[PDB]
Amino acid sequence: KLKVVATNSIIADITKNIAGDKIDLHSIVPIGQDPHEYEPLPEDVKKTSEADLIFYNGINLETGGNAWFTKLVENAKKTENKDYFAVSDGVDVIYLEGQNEKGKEDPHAWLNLENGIIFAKNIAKQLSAKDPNNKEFYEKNLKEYTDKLDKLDKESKDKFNKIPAEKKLIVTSEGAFKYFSKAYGVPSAYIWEINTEEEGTPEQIKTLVEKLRQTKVPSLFVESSVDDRPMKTVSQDTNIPIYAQIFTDSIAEQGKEGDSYYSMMKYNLDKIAEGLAK
Ligand SMILES: [Mn+2]
């Protein structure tokens, strides 16, 4: 069976939904861990060597740890677009605020279901290319999976319409909501823009607090994959309660709510809608 490697639990989850049990999947970044700067383990390095097909997010996700993914994929002598593929190829890339080049991209594409579908299309493409036997299975799973996602996106484009503008702000630690914001029309603020930066300096915190004091935002959120101290601080300083943990860089641990791309997207939608209705 096809030996596949996903860099993180999101891509891995999407992959499972395409490949079912037709492949040997290994997911590098453990659930709940930050996929921006990860130190691949020996099993990770071995599985990547043996892999027929490696999926990563690209658009500047796995290029901290000073390019851990690049170095992973160097050492394993793998070739871009032959052995490994960025599953974000195709997304309308959004860039980080201020800096603006290759390495100014914001990686968080998947917080837009349409992009989640693009990922699935890319994942399915490559699975088929590399394992033509199961081409049909994949495409069938794909069509089903993207329907599931598309429905959900279709249903959610409205969720936020009734939120009073001055409450309508998603606040999370990392600025991982740019795509979400664009897709569902709810602005987002944050303590640090991307996890590769210092995380939760008194300055970032002050900046966010001062922005928040100007709002009537009822709830802050905190992602499942970051230290929550900084946001607790924001919470305390603005007296805005942290309403829910949500999912940016990772799906939930096995069995919890949100433990798949689809249901983490569903969870986020729901919790944020409730959180901001409060
Ligand atoms: Mn992130």
Numbering used by the authors: 32 to 309
Give the exact sentences the study uses for this entry.
The crystal structure of PsaA had previously been determined with Zn(II) tetrahedrally coordinated by the four metal-binding residues (His67, His139, Glu205 and Asp280) but no structure for the Mn(II)-loaded protein has been reported. Well-defined and continuous electron density was observed for the active site residues that tetrahedrally coordinated the metal ion, which was identified as Mn(II) (see Text S2 for further details). The tetrahedral coordination of Mn(II) is analogous to Zn(II) coordination in PsaA and the structures of other Cluster A-1 SBPs (Treponema pallidum TroA, Synechocystis 6803 MntC, Synechocystis 6803 ZnuA and E. coli ZnuA). Overall, our structural analysis indicates that PsaA is capable of binding Mn(II) and Zn(II) with only very minor accompanying structural changes in the final loaded state. Metal ion discrimination within the Cluster A-1 SBPs is proposed to occur through subtle differences in the binding sites, Zn(II)-binding being favoured by the presence of three N ligands (from His residues), and Mn(II)-binding being favoured by two N (His) and two O (Asp or Glu) ligands. The derived affinity constants (1/KA = KD) calculated for 1∶1 complexes of PsaA with Mn(II) or Zn(II) were 3.3±1.0 nM and 231±1.9 nM, respectively. However, the preference of PsaA for Mn(II) is the result of the highly unfavourable entropic contribution of Zn(II) binding (−TΔS = 9.5±0.4 kcal.mol−1) relative to Mn(II) (−TΔS =  −4.0±0.9 kcal.mol−1). Here we show PsaA in complex with its physiological ligand and the difference in the affinities for Mn(II) and Zn(II) confirm its physiological role in Mn(II) acquisition. Furthermore, consistent with the lack of solvent access to the binding site in the metal loaded-PsaA structures, we observed that Zn(II) could not be extracted from PsaA by chelating agents, despite the protein's lower affinity for the metal, or by competition with Mn(II).
Studies from our laboratory have previously demonstrated that the pneumococcal surface antigen A (PsaA) from S. pneumoniae has a clear interaction with Zn(II) despite not being involved in its uptake, which occurs via a distinct Zn(II) ATP-binding cassette (ABC) permease.
